[PDB]
């Protein structure tokens, strides 16, 4: 792959870094450590805060807002590492910024980074 080319979504494999919901992921795909696309692995704590991004779904043509909530309280999974940045802004726009450990709100004040999930909030806008 060419790192610098426009990122191109697919809707066929969630463990791949070009999976459409991963348009602005930073870290590791939770599906690769016993989580799922939208759920945390056992033992980890689910953040309630996240960076977001509208990502294009090539399947239905719609844009959806994805909330990149982290699963926390574990050392980094080290499995399926990805870093995409579609619409990603610098830190003074934290709401769209992805270097931030988005663990706030996790049970037990877990603030360590394990992996990220890719749930849809809602739409277009």
């Amino acid at each position: 792959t060419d790192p610098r080319a426009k990122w191109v979504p697919q809707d066929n494999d969630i463990q791949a870094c070009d999976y459409w919901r991963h348009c602005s992921i930073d870290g590791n795909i939770c599906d690769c450590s016993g989580g799922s696309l939208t759920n945390c692995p056992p033992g980890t704590k689910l953040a309630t805060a996240s960076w977001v991004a509208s990502c294009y779904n090539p399947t239905d043509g719609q844009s959806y807002l994805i909330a990149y909530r982290d699963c926390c309280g574990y050392n980094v999974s080290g499995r399926c590492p990805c870093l995409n940045t579609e619409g990603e802004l610098p830190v003074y726009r934290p709401e769209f910024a992805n270097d931030i450990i988005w663990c706030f709100g996790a049970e037990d004040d877990a603030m360590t980074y394990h992996c990220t999930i890719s749930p849809i909030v809602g739409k277009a806008s």
């Binding site: 996240s50 977001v52 709401e95 988005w102 706030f104 809602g122 739409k123």
Partner: protein
């Protein structure tokens, strides 16, 4: 404690009675920085935008524990009934720069 929670979950904006203390949320801002309400009053936050938001009072503010409200999607709402006079700060969990105050008289 200092507040009761009418509904644990967010509910739909359409739900909120017509004469009602409302804080709108839009363009990364609470509508009022400082809301003045009487003891026994319900405040409803309404998110008008797609960006999810909440209201979060740190531990010791409304009680011993933090009151971390649920994330509200576009057109969802969340209420707190204030049962004691005081001033109570809050913020949006992912957006610390979004800050508000409830002044209860």
């Amino acid at each position: 404690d200092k507040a009761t929670i009418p509904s644990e979950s967010p509910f739909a904006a359409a739900e909120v009675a017509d004469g009602a203390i409302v804080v709108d949320i839009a363009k990364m801002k609470y509508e009022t920085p400082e809301l003045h309400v009487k003891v026994g009053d319900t405040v409803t936050w309404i998110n008008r935008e797609a960006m999810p938001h909440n209201v979060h009072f740190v531990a010791g503010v409304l009680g011993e524990a933090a009151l971390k409200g649920p994330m509200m999607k576009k057109e969802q709402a969340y209420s707190l009934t204030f049962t004691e006079a005081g001033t109570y700060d809050y913020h949006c969990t992912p957006h610390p720069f979004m800050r508000g105050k409830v002044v209860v008289e």
